[PDB]
Design a protein around this ligand. Sequence first.
Ligand SMILES: O[C@@H]1[C@@H](O)[C@H](O[C@@H]2CO[C@@H](O[C@@H]3CO[C@@H](O[C@@H]4CO[C@@H](O[C@@H]5CO[C@@H](O)[C@H](O)[C@H]5O)[C@H](O)[C@H]4O)[C@H](O)[C@H]3O)[C@H](O)[C@H]2O)OC[C@H]1O
Ligand SMILES: *[C@@H]1O[C@H](CO)[C@@H](O)[C@H](O)[C@H]1NC(C)=O
Ligand SMILES: *[C@@H]1O[C@H](CO)[C@@H](O)[C@H](O)[C@H]1NC(C)=O
Ligand SMILES: [Cl-]
Ligand SMILES: [Cl-]
Ligand SMILES: [Cl-]
Ligand SMILES: [Cl-]
Ligand SMILES: [Cl-]
Ligand SMILES: [Cl-]
Ligand SMILES: [Cl-]
Ligand SMILES: [Cl-]
Ligand SMILES: [Cl-]
Ligand SMILES: [Cu+2]
Length: 235
Amino acid sequence: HTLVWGVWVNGVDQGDGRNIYIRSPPNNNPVKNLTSPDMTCNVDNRVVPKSVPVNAGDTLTFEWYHNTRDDDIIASSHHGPIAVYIAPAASNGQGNVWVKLFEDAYNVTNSTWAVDRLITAHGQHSVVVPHVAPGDYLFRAEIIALHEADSLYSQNPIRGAQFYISCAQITINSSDDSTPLPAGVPFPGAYTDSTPGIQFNIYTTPATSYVAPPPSVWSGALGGSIAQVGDASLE
Ligand SMILES: O[C@@H]1[C@@H](O)[C@H](O[C@@H]2CO[C@@H](O[C@@H]3CO[C@@H](O[C@@H]4CO[C@@H](O[C@@H]5CO[C@@H](O)[C@H](O)[C@H]5O)[C@H](O)[C@H]4O)[C@H](O)[C@H]3O)[C@H](O)[C@H]2O)OC[C@H]1O
Ligand SMILES: *[C@@H]1O[C@H](CO)[C@@H](O)[C@H](O)[C@H]1NC(C)=O
Ligand SMILES: *[C@@H]1O[C@H](CO)[C@@H](O)[C@H](O)[C@H]1NC(C)=O
Ligand SMILES: [Cl-]
Ligand SMILES: [Cl-]
Ligand SMILES: [Cl-]
Ligand SMILES: [Cl-]
Ligand SMILES: [Cl-]
Ligand SMILES: [Cl-]
Ligand SMILES: [Cl-]
Ligand SMILES: [Cl-]
Ligand SMILES: [Cl-]
Ligand SMILES: [Cu+2]
């Protein structure tokens, strides 16, 4: 159970974005139905009044929280991967439009899942803004908690993988458009019951065996990380 508070750009807090530049749902409940329109941008997908200005090569940091800002972030039991997708805003997230910019599942050296490191990072994870066409975009951050992913929601609606999905409105101003955005995948649609990484038993299968759900990260992506960039408590 987790939500996005706001974003930072180049290490500078953009301010509380809830219902402003984040298409925030009313609470931190997961989405579980892979076929639902809620998979796109969660349960209250509508245009919000602001879009955060960035330039290609900027560091965009999402900041998550549980109940209040800079708390325990997400329950420790919710082990699983983190991904970030991008789509043009004109799509409203519909169609074959979502391109993956970032994936982190399990780090063998550290023996930690992405969620574990998100907690340590005070909720913060980043992507570098790619050299796509200037314009308005949606950035879709997605945490998959796997604690009940041994079952499929479609079969047992009280269990299943849990998706914590947040869409930020981002305007890319300066970019050369040297890496124009390629074809993407649909949400809902890209994940099905048989997709690698949707049904998995974290308790009995080694975490090193885990494969996150495709698509693969786009070759034009410029990187990212799960790491604290700013101290919320100084404000
Ligand atoms: O040996 C292994 C077994 O142990 C393994 O069992 C699994 C263990 O984990 C089980 O899942 C737990 C389900 O309950 C979650 O706690 C809930 C989370 O939600 C809380 O409510 C929200 C809190 O946040 C507020 O903001 C929000 O308003 C609330 O709605 C609620 O209070 C908690 O009870 C635990 O985090 C999960 O760990 C799982 O079902 C078992 O299968 O099975 C495999 C076996 O090998
Ligand atoms: C899952 O979503 C689809 C598509 O909106 C819907 O038809 C179906 O009833 C949902 N399943 C549940 C259990 O609500
Ligand atoms: C691995 O753990 C060390 C200390 O435990 C930490 O400094 C480092 O950031 C971790 N790696 C990642 C990818 O966070
Ligand atoms: Cl603020
Ligand atoms: Cl759902
Ligand atoms: Cl604006
Ligand atoms: Cl708060
Ligand atoms: Cl919790
Ligand atoms: Cl950190
Ligand atoms: Cl739960
Ligand atoms: Cl550029
Ligand atoms: Cl980064
Ligand atoms: Cu939860």
